[PDB]
């Protein structure tokens, strides 16, 4: 039915939503990320990363390891199923993945890899 969602990230270091449900009917699914903040990408760096909960941690750590020039995402991370590009206030981005990469029964989670954001910026993506 509906296969698009508008996820926001503000200067207060928080997503405008904390749960996404993807209609199995969707062949693909896209999320649009915008930054209604005022703080630049190096200060208030916001992105949207998807991955199962089991790897929500590592992906977040290794992502801290890398840096601004790496989008705070480790390069060649097979743990991430989909991801936006780290953006700063005023910016927007959207990623369109195939819902076939997702699986029913399995719990996925989306978050932000910028250091110190994943605590106040995560959620659950539900496939049903
Ligand atoms: Cu539809
Ligand atoms: Cu962030």
UniProtKB/Swiss-Prot annotation:
Taken from the record, one Pfam family name reads: Copper-bind
- Does the entry annotate any disulfide bonds, and if so which pairs? 3-26
Question: What PROSITE patterns is this protein classified in?
Answer: COPPER_BLUE (PS00196)
Q: Identify the main location.
A: periplasm
Alphabetically ordered keywords of this record: Copper, Disulfide bond, Electron transport, Metal-binding, Periplasm, Signal, Transport
**Where in the cell?**
Periplasm
Does this UniProt record's set of keywords contain Acetylation?
no
The Plastocyanin-like domain covers 1-128
What's any one GO cellular component for it? plasma membrane
The protein's matches in InterPro entries, at most eight in alphabetical order, are given as: Azurin, BlueCu_1, BlueCu_1_BS, Cu-binding_ET, Cupredoxin
- Its Gene Ontology molecular function terms? copper ion binding; electron transfer activity; identical protein binding; transition metal ion binding; zinc ion binding
- Residues that, per the record, bind Cu cation: 46, 112, 117, 121
Asked whether the UniProt record includes Protein biosynthesis among its keywords, one would answer no
Q: What does this protein do?
A: Transfers electrons from cytochrome c551 to cytochrome oxidase.
Q: Sorted alphabetically, which PANTHER family does this protein's record hold? A: AURACYANIN-B, OUTER MEMBRANE PROTEIN H.8
Designated name of the protein: Azurin
